[PDB]
């Protein structure tokens, strides 16, 4: 609607019978294939993110957001419990650091 | 010629793949829109009996 | 060719204005299309239509 | 010719046949004067809405 | 098929030609809304052969290649629903039928291959389910919801749109 993309912010410009709009948008350029998974298991509960989302690297795995590439350790603070490790399809496992 | 609806790309879909991008271009795009045209008020009876 | 969408409105609205005053002078069947040489030249009967 | 008019001097050079000009979509707005030979627009008079 | 009768149509202006001007913008405006209805993309995006988006069934809007047009069930039942001398002329439109489908294949794989990604940029893959996640998210329902209760709505997707079926089968 505000242009092709995220729109952060427009600028109206005068034209002759009309209006010309100068719309701000967000658009990513640059990205990479990452191993992602819909939660994770550490003591037999399940760890669903917050606000992002699982990626690993080959080894490590990292919570970061969906729009940017922002590798976080998977924390408490980032992740919350819900229901058991046996009804999830596609988990895994990995460490839950507590802070 | 018949054309083309543009190029073929194959996205790699799996389950256990994602494409998070790294970077980002802010980009500004112009759009045209008319409001208003020039106004004209022909005389009804001059045009045809002037 | 950014503006053309107005470009294209002021030539419509232009474009109307021309045809208009071109058909001013049409014949529309009459014996011509000046409305004083169709006036002073028969009686009043054969004018009027 | 007729019509009615304010006449005013002109600048547009015409030929030495020509007589009467006209502008777009076929308008008399400019004759010459048959005895001086001279040019001179015939614009037409003021008229509008009260 | 007439001399004199055009003799006595040219004292009427031109109005012939204005009609015939409006006629080829209602044309050109006709084909400008298509174009703008569907031809939204810049890449015509292809499904991966397998077929392992969650338990979500999409063969049912999917194109199928056994079939000379590349069109979907649905697209096939919808299109076998709807039904000169004086210069009467339907002009053919300038995306056939085959193009508009290509059209519908290349939104339907973006969409379920990258989620809303496609149209702000690039085209970011992404499983099925975590689309659906991000769906639940936006509409206000945590995800944990999703991931628990995957197989009810795909089973329950996949009667909906056997009924929606049936339905342009059944009735018009
Ligand atoms: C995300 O994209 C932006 C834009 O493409 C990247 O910024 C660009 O970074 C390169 C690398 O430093 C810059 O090239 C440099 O140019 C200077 C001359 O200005 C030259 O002396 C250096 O040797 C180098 O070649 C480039 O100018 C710069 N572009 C802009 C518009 O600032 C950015 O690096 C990208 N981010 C990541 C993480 O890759
Ligand atoms: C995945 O990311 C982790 C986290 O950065 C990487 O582990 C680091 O690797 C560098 C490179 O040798 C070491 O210097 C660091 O000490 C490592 N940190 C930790 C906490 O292990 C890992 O190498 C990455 N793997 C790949 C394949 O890129
Ligand atoms: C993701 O999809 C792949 C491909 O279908 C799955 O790999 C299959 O796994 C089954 C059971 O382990 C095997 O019998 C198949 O031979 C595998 N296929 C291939 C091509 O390797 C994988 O299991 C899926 N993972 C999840 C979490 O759904
Ligand atoms: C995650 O860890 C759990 C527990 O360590 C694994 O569950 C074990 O799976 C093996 C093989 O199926 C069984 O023999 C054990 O009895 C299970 N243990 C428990 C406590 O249930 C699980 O397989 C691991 N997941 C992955 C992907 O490695
Ligand atoms: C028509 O007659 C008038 C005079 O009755 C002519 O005007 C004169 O033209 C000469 C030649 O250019 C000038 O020297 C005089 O000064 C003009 N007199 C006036 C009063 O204007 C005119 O040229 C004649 N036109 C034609 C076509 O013969
Ligand atoms: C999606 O639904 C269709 C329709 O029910 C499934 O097609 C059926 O597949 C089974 C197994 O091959 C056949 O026995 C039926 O005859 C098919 N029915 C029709 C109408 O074609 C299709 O298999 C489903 N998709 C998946 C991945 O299971
Ligand atoms: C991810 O992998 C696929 C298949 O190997 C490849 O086509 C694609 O370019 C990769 N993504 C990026 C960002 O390079």
Redesign the pocket.
Known sequence: FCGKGYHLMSFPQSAPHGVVFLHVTYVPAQEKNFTTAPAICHDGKAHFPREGVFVSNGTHWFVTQRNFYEPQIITTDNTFVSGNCDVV??IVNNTVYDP | YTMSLGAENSVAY???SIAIPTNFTISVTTEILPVSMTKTSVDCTMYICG | SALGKLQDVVNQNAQALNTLVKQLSSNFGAISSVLNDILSRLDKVEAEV | LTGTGVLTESNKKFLPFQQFGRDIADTTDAVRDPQTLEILDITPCSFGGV | DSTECSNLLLQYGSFCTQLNRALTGIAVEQDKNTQEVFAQVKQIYKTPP?K?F?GFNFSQILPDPSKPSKRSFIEDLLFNKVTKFNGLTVLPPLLTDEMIAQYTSALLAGTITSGWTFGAGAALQIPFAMQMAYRFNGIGVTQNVLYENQKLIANQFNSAIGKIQDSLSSTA
Request: cysteine-free; proline content about 0%; overall charge negative.
């Open positions: 399809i596609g | 799996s389950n256990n | 397998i392992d969650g």
